[PDB]
Design a protein around this ligand. Structure first.
Ligand SMILES: [Cl-]
Ligand SMILES: [Cl-]
Lengths: 227, 230
């Protein structure tokens, strides 16, 4: 009767993608939250911060919510057959299938974006269509029971939506007030539509080698789905 | 053109509200000339208030002199406000840090360390009455700056002030690049993050739920204030 919520925790994850929604969802009644990898134990995020997986794939309980974070480590995941199989198996019966940042590219490599509206991190957005998605340039995109968010803390925001659907709006509002979640960034450069032009160009340049590498990974992942 | 590292340290204590720390950590760790640290008595596991396990990277003694110190909040603050070794470390680092910062009830720890005397500061809304006994001038704003002190009450206030720190340590374009590279653009689906905007029933239940903790924390705060010299 507890709601089972699971985050995939993989090497080189962007940890805030996971830790943001974790702190929101773990505050709810009647929830048990899991950090899933191939075995329990330390997993190093892209920043070097060390997290602890709490369960192996095989020992994870059937999940009501699955959440795939993004980060540097996504490229490996997109070609990891054991991880992709776990994600597919959980998604087949989960109430909610979710991702943050380039975690949606992992859902895509698993075949779970076929014909679905979805978003990802803005620098990699061109990789959605080859994975079968209908690309949408919005912060949180919902298609049926699929929720994808692009930005680093998009999971915090969609976690509050999930709280309201799993429980009720008053429960989501209570968590927001108890945590005093009231963001107010001091700059307006969180979207390529609003950042200075030179900032867009430099951010793109810093992502270019990763995007080039992920283009080839994405093409291979798409070809494997077709074959 | 300097690439001298900015040493940025977060105090990682048992029963921390982990997002207070993990938010600004991921923002600041994305900068090429930042070195971040997670500090406790020893390196090793530290369990957050949710049960999520974090890992301290350095003891107090082995921590390099910090340029930024950040104290998070959470259930564990009550113990920390009467932890002499931790408070001494905070004072020593604050004395030579370019910026002294806190999130949520981390400012009550700064207060217990004697660092809020006569300073404008904020904390989590449910505990805001505990600032004045620690010498602070209480201010009800999301992020409050006084000299080199920055305090913020909300769970992710450190994400927001991390961008301010990036702009002052480096330049505005660098802060904007962080924000875009991480695509940080929050848009909450509810407007209940303040007692001034949440539904009345929600405020009532949150205040009732916090009452026991406020009562105990007031007792702790009074002892911590008594220990402050003079
Ligand atoms: Cl607290
Ligand atoms: Cl975001």
């Amino acid at each position: 009767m507890a709601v089972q919520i699971g985050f995939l925790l993989f090497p080189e994850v962007q940890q805030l993608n996971l830790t943001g929604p974790h702190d929101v969802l773990a505050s709810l009644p009647d929830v048990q939250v899991h950090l899933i990898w191939k075995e329990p134990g330390p997993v190093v995020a892209s920043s070097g911060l060390v997290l602890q997986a709490t369960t192996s794939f095989a020992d994870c309980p059937p999940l009501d919510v699955i959440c795939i974070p993004g980060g540097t480590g996504v490229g490996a995941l997109m070609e990891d057959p054991q991880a992709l199989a776990f994600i597919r198996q959980q998604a087949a019966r989960a109430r909610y299938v979710t991702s943050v940042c380039t975690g949606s590219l992992v859902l895509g490599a698993a075949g779970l974006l076929q014909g679905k509206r979805a978003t990802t991190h803005w620098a990699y957005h061109e990789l959605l269509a080859p994975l079968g998605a209908i690309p949408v340039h919005e912060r949180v995109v919902r298609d049926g029971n699929l929720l994808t968010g692009g930005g680093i803390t998009a999971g915090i925001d969609f976690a509050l939506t999930l709280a309201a659907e799993l429980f009720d709006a008053a429960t989501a509002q209570r968590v927001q007030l108890q945590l005093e979640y009231a963001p107010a960034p001091p700059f307006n450069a969180g979207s390529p539509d609003t950042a200075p032009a030179s900032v867009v160009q430099q951010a793109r340049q810093r992502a270019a080698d990763s995007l080039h590498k992920r283009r080839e990974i994405t093409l291979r992942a798409a070809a494997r789905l077709a074959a």
